[PDB]
Design a binder for this molecule. Structure first.
Ligand SMILES: Cc1cc2nc3c(=O)[nH]c(=O)nc-3n(C[C@H](O)[C@H](O)[C@H](O)COP(=O)(O)OP(=O)(O)OC[C@H]3O[C@@H](n4cnc5c(N)ncnc54)[C@H](O)[C@@H]3O)c2cc1C
Length: 383
């Protein structure tokens, strides 16, 4: 009397979809080939950044799915009431916020959603790697690579397996899918701003700089940002071109001089010798942009959410927020159609694709104003 569902991917989007589906009564199994991140045996926690910005909407999405833990999950998240722009003279300026934004720890949020799933019907399959799907007109046979095979069968499948979605590949045999993938020159380095030693009254904690703002040091074709953490430290990220970075990392002192010159107001609060070490032992990461049409196999057999459907630019686009919104849109559609996945999924591709071609235009307009169009003397160096 209940339909069963396979969810491929236990990242932020995958879990949230598992929650929203248990909550509706479906029989959720959730797979990931990586190990349970909650076990410290796992070295690789698949953590792209230490923390993220979760918008009003992403909170609203997570709310409608798990109204309960939406507050024993979003506890320590820090609300940032605007941006703080840092010019080259270290001068810093508050620009208040249409939609608000909060700093939340990624590994924590990913782990909290996992826990919430144990308090529900959902079975969790870690160490399982989806490798093939056969498409019948009733139940879909999924094959896995543990450890060496295994299979299983399901009324329908959800691909939540990120940017190189195996589920997307399998779907591409069954459907004519417009597909595009682009690799950007954009690279990112993770830096760190330690907590001050003493409690700072004006900031409500051990924060070197204002924790209720998203700190941006906008330069020409590159950028430094910072977001507060609960302990007083800031997760900091450097974004620039692959070519800029690779010309820099050849000379240990070069990187150093680059930093001091472009971000003078961060030497006091950051450990510079280690900042250089971070830049050079920086792990190459492909950044891919992907698009998909449609998001689903006809007759409600399968669907794509998260990066699997639409991997966008870090920072300028908001992946996680969008994946969360995906789930909310999907469920609301399943209700309007009373459980008809075939008529729901179909409308999902219709309306989501409208949304997400406009969304990947506000991530270019955002690339434009903040990063490409930087020429003024306050944000650009003259030797
Ligand atoms: C540096 C950086 C900062 C970012 N900051 C923000 C931000 O502030 N706000 C925001 O909204 N977005 C941000 N994003 C984008 C955001 O991180 C992603 O869009 C989001 O994590 C997508 O999650 P996902 O669950 O869809 O996919 P993923 O995080 O990629 O998770 C998919 C899971 O599927 C698993 N998997 C893959 N293949 C298989 C297989 N076939 N079988 C089983 N499992 C499989 C993977 O192991 C993975 O755990 C940022 C991205 C980066 C790189």
């Amino acid at each position: 009397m209940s339909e069963s569902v396979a969810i491929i991917g236990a990242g932020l989007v995958g879990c949230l979809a598992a929650l929203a589906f248990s909550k509706e009564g479906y029989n959720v199994t959730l797979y990931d080939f990586r190990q349970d991140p909650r076990l410290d045996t796992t070295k690789n926690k698949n953590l792209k950044s230490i923390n993220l910005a979760i918008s009003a909407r992403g909170i609203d999405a997570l709310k409608s799915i798990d109204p309960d833990a939406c507050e024993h999950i979003l506890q320590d998240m820090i609300p940032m009431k605007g941006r703080m722009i840092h010019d080259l003279k270290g001068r810093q300026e508050s620009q208040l916020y249409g939609e608000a934004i909060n700093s939340i720890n990624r590994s924590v949020l990913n782990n909290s959603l996992l826990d919430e799933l144990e308090k529900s019907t959902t079975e969790l399959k870690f160490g399982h790697k989806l490798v093939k799907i056969e498409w019948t007109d009733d139940k879909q046979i999924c094959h896995f690579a543990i450890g060496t095979p295994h299979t299983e069968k399901y009324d329908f499948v959800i691909g939540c397996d990120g940017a190189y979605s195996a589920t997307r590949s399998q779907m591409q045999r069954k459907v004519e899918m417009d597909f595009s993938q682009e690799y950007m020159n954009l690279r990112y380095i993770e830096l760190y701003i330690p907590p001050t030693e003493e409690f700072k009254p004006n900031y409500g904690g051990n924060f070197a700089i204002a924790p209720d703002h998203l700190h941006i040091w906008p330069r020409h074709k590159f950028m430094l940002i910072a977001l507060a953490n609960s302990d007083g430290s800031f997760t900091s990220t450097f974004f620039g071109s692959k070519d800029q970075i690779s010309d820099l990392i050849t000379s240990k002192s070069r990187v150093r001089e680059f930093l001091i010159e472009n971000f003078p107001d961060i030497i006091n609060i950051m450990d510079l010798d280690d900042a250089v070490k971070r830049f050079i032992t920086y792990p190459k990461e492909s950044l891919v942009c992907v698009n998909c049409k449609p998001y689903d196999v006809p007759g409600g057999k399968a669907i794509l959410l998260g990066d699997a459907a639409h991997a966008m630019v870090p920072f300028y686009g908001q992946g996680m927020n969008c994946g969360f919104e995906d789930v909310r849109i999907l469920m609301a559609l399943l209700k309007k159609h009373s459980g008809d996945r075939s008529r729901a999924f179909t409308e999902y591709t219709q309306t989501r694709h409208k949304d997400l071609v406009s969304i990947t235009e506000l991530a270019k307009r955002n690339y434009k104003e903040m990063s490409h169009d930087v020429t003024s003397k306050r944000f650009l160096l003259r030797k």
